[PDB]
Amino acid sequence: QPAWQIVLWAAAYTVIVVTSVVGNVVVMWIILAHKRMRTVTNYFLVNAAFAEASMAAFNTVVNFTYAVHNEWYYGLFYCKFHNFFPIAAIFASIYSMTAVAFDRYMAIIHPLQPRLSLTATKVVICVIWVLALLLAFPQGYYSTTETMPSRVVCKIEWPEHPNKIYEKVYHICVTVLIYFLPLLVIGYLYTVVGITLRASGIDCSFWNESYLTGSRDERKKSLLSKFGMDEGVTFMFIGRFDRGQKGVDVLLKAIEILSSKKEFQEMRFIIIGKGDPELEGWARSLEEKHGNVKVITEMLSREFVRELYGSVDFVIIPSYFEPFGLVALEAMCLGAIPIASAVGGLRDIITNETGILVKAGDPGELANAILKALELSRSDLSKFRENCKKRAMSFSEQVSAARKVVKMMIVVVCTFAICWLPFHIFFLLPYINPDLLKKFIQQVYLAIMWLAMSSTMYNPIIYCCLNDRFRLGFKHAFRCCPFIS
């Protein structure tokens, strides 16, 4: 191999070393030196930054030179460290990222359950390092320098056994512990969290009362006149007509219960949806029997639905099953006060001060909640509507912020997975097809090892790109340079 290629490879590995050391040291300064940054998540990130900066500072140069010149000149202790540290460092790093993913999963999926205190996170960090050092110990213990037979090499001398079963089992278990298992765990955690956050998202640039015109009373009166009705307290339902799911059968039973009451004269109902023909026929018979009931089975534009949310008094959401409840957020953003089953995301979003909640599947409690809404309508409802809108906005703000942090950690984990896949494939291939034929293998090995080692420099760059606080910290760290002011 020509020397100019060696100089280029040496420059590339040097870029890894300097980028990883500078970026991870600045990350540790950004977290440790600023009291607002001292959180559970940032403590695990500091631990990962320490492990990655250490592996880059203390392994990369000799890994390169030994790959290029296959004689070991660096002593016995460094031979042990060379085979010991990378395993412990990658273990500590990836399990710190796994702890971060678990902390986010707990905060979003089980908010009531206690999470780690800061001292508990320091204990977990020490435990992670103890397990990492114990896992890496055998490689350190069996490493030795020896002529093979005439020139010195650093080699792991495993106890001779049944066709090297001990090294094979150890290599497989390490590859599982530092790659496949943590990736599967983090992938489960962030799949559940990312789906939950995206399904709890709403477009506030559309579902927004600012795009309606006039007073709410003029809008409601114009809407009821468009449906041919006299003014009254207006309840709206929108959803599929089915049994055991979206609850239109519960609402129809509740309307039948209310129809004998005198208060029924003051109510108006708009039932929007399609589905089970029996439920459609039941709704149409209620629509013909009663002049204060209207049914819409045709599909509606989201603009017309936004107009409805901004005009009706209440939106009834009698779901048996509602994991995320974006429909509650749409109603509350437009000032419609929700009347909903206390299940799932509805129970999470709506509060006593921002809506009326009922037991799912109970037409009588839904009818009583509708009568309660009618009692409330005699008074001004402006404050109630303001509370609904404020709750929907603040819930949406938290969702977007969590989505940004989760997107950053997903980019972190995907980058780790990409950087280490070729490395583990290169070392697992002999078991599958033992033909590592040169075929430019040293160039392939230098490239694969460069990608693997470069994994240690990306996280500070990812933090600077995808997190405002880390970008501000990097600006503060590099203020001297003629860019930042």
Ligand SMILES: Cc1ccccc1-c1cc(N2CCN(C)CC2)ncc1N(C)C(=O)C(C)(C)c1cc(C(F)(F)F)cc(C(F)(F)F)c1
């Ligand atoms: C034991 C092991 C675990 C995981 C992946 C590969 C192996 C492995 C297996 C075999 N075997 C089995 C297959 N067959 C070829 C016979 C010999 N030989 C050499 C291996 N390696 C590369 C190492 O031990 C050392 C130098 C300690 C190392 C590990 C990592 C790690 F963190 F990824 F683990 C990262 C780095 C660094 F990035 F710094 F370069 C260096």
